[PDB]
Every structure is written in C-alpha cells, then in structure tokens.
Design a protein around this ligand. Sequence first.
Ligand SMILES: COCCOc1cnc2ccn([C@H](C)c3nnc4c(F)cc(-c5cnn(C)c5)cn34)c(=O)c2c1
Length: 289
Amino acid sequence: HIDLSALNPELVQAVQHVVIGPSSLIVHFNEVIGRGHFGCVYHGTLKIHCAVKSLNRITDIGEVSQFLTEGIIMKDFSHPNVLSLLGICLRSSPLVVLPYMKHGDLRNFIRNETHNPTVKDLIGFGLQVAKGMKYLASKKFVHRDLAARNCMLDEKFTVKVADFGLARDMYDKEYYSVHNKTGAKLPVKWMALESLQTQKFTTKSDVWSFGVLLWELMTRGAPPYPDVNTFDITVYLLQGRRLLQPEYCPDPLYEVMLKCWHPKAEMRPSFSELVSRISAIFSTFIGEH
Ligand SMILES: COCCOc1cnc2ccn([C@H](C)c3nnc4c(F)cc(-c5cnn(C)c5)cn34)c(=O)c2c1
C-alpha cells in the first residue's frame, strides 16, 4: 500500500511517474535471465522488452516510503551509459522494472568465445563506463561495487553502469567476502586500500574500482589477483604491488590504471579526467566492431 503522506511532500508528485500499473506489465516467470542473492530476474513485456527483478529472497523490503524514495531518485537519473529504472510494479514484494540488456554483463560478454572485440572496442567499453561514472559522480552518487560483472550491454552494444539503487545485488557471489568484525560482504579485489581499512566508500574508491575494471577489459575478463586469498589483498597491495600490465593494454592505458590506484585517494583522477585521457588513447586506434 502506498502511503503518500509518509513521503517527503516534495516527492509525492513524482510517485505517479515511478509506479507501473500491473495491467501494463506481463512477467514471464518461466524463464530466469538473472540470479541475485536478493532475488531472480525475469523477462517482462511492458510492447517493449524489460527485465523484472524480484526482491522476495529477502525476508523484508524495509520502509516502503524509503523504497519509493530510492525509486524516485533513481528514475531521475538519465544517461546513455547508466542503466535506467523504468519503474516499480506492485503485486498482491514489489518488482523492479529495468530495460532489457540483450548482451548481458560486460565480464561475460568479453569472456565469450563467440564475440571478438578488438583492442579499440575494449578501450571503447572502458570509455563508456567512464562517461556513466562521470554522470553518477556529478549527481554525488557513489556506486560502491563497480566491476565488469556490474555493467551490462544492450542490443547496440551500448555499455551501461548497472547494479545500483533498486537493482543492487550480488550477481556473482564468488567475489564477495565476509568482513569478520562487521559481517558485510565486500568486493575486496575491487576495493581501494582505504576502503579495505575503513569500509567507507567514495567516488575516489569508485575510481580505484574503475582501474580494476579497465584491467578486466584488457585481459578479456581474467579474475584479478587469483593467487591472493580474500582479505590478504591488503597485505599484498602494501608490499608495493599492483595488477600487471596486460599484453594488449597500451602503455598510456596502464599509466591510467596506476593513477586510478594511487595510494592517496585525493590524487586519483576524476572521472572527467578519465574520460578525457581514455578518449585520446581510443582515438589513436583503427579497427573495431
Ligand atoms: C545473457 O543475458 C541475457 C539477458 O538477461 C538479462 C537482460 N537484462 C537484464 C537487466 C537487468 N538485470 C538485473 C536487474 C541487473 N541489474 N544490474 C545488473 C548487473 F550489473 C549485472 C547483472 C548480472 C547478471 N548476471 N550476471 C553475471 C551479472 C544483472 N544486473 C538482469 O539480470 C538482466 C538480465
């Protein structure tokens, strides 16, 4: 039930634009297209193709006014490299309605044997992520879980930063480790040093994660630091170590990665700078699909 008075009065008007009437959404529960810890994702027809995420694997949604507020904030985000929220549908837990992303998550796409992106293509995927993150950062939004598994591609191969707001989940449980003091399940191999120490996330720790994501692109989806175990990553990094330069990664792109992993968070490049530097490197290449 929607209690309009429980919302901030400023936001009441925006509710009509986020809520999807059940007569407008056919959900095909016969075919799972995504699996999160908090719930499964299904085909949906809104005629446009959509992805419908359940949150029923969680025992409770939380404060319904807060859930709507998150929806309202999220729907106002609009950028070609950020996954949009189409809306929220209520059933007698609510369903989150996202655009259909035909080619799935970026990591699986670059690992796929049937597709063959060139080096220029891979750098271009990187640039598209950088633009999405420049936009999210301009809205003061900290992602906290940027990684190739958490970006998706549509039918035109447009790359979108995903896995945030009401779509946030663990879609590959392998890469999340339980903190012993806090219990939080953390993507430690994508995390900045300071975040591993404090569990505080900033746009500058998203930039660190972005550097790792660039490394994933250039290795076509290799797992980072395979011979390091979970929270021993802090010890590993503090030995004076970083991920090695992939074979087909240009020297300037590796230099970009090293700047993203700067020990001083404030000395890491902004996402605007990353878009600028990467656009330059991208422009030096010929040949792409
Ligand atoms: C091969 O892909 C077939 C298309 O299936 C789709 C098509 N479109 C979508 C759209 C959204 N989602 C959920 C809500 C979602 N939202 N963000 C993400 C994300 F960042 C990653 C994933 C994901 C799914 N599987 N994996 C490995 C990662 C799923 N994500 C989906 O799971 C989803 C699944």
